[PDB]
Design a binder for this molecule. Structure first.
Ligand SMILES: Nc1nc(C(=O)O)c(CCc2ccccc2)s1
Ligand SMILES: [Zn+2]
Ligand SMILES: [Zn+2]
Length: 219
């Protein structure tokens, strides 16, 4: 029924994986994550929704010679974490913030095997950075920065045309978090949202506008 998992080169050593779900009320929702190649190793930036799509994604790269060295989930929702259970089962290291794992635990979900905390975290020193801007889409949302190509993966926090599911959002904090993200990452060449097309740094401004507007609307 749905379109198939898509894998497409974004930049040198950077691929976008897109998986799909049909959500009641929203229609067909694409979900973007990244695969980042460092030498002969691959790192997943968010998992697809399902174990099946995660297995497809991993084997696409294995079959091309890359070893999967780990995955990082940008927040606790299943469009970022759905694949952790399968990855653990393959002894592929999974990473999430401490806050994300606590939210998984509390949601009754399997957690990543490695956790980190703090505002900045190197998944791979000088190549794959994780940054916590503050709460917005969810309390735990982090973003991932790739310094060489200046690519920002913004996950479900980057929401340039509407905020999406607010079930777990903190709309009071989201404009401060987004303003912080915009100042820190305005030099990004590419910004990759979870659910909308890749754009440039202006997606950070659009997200701040959507956050402010959403705060104002709620009064
Ligand atoms: N897996 C899903 N995540 C979200 C989310 O908000 O992150 C969904 C809501 C659909 C939507 C996505 C983007 C903009 C507007 C609406 S569905
Ligand atoms: Zn989410
Ligand atoms: Zn989402």
């Amino acid at each position: 029924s749905l379109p198939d998992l898509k894998i497409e080169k974004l930049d040198e050593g950077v691929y976008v994986h897109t998986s799909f779900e049909e959500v009641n009320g929203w229609g067909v929702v694409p979900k973007h994550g990244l695969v980042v190649l460092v030498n002969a190793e691959a790192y997943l930036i968010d998992t697809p929704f399902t174990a099946k799509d995660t297995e497809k994604l991993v084997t696409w790269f294995v079959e091309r010679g890359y070893k999967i060295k780990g995955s990082i989930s940008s927040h606790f929702h299943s469009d970022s974490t759905g694949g952790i259970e399968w990855l653990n089962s393959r002894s592929i290291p999974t990473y999430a913030s401490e806050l994300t794992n606590e939210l998984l635990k509390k949601d009754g979900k399997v957690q990543a095997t490695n956790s980190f905390s703090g505002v900045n975290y190197w998944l791979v020193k000088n190549k794959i950075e994780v940054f916590y801007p503050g709460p917005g889409h969810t309390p735990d949302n982090v973003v991932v920065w790739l310094p060489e190509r200046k690519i920002l993966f913004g996950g479900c926090f980057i929401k340039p045309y509407g905020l999406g599911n607010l079930g777990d959002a903190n709309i009071e904090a989201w404009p401060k978090s987004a303003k912080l993200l915009k100042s820190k990452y305005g030099k990004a060449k590419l910004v990759v949202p979870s659910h909308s097309e890749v754009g440039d740094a202006s997606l950070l401004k659009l997200t701040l506008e959507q956050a402010v507007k959403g705060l104002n609307e709620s009064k």
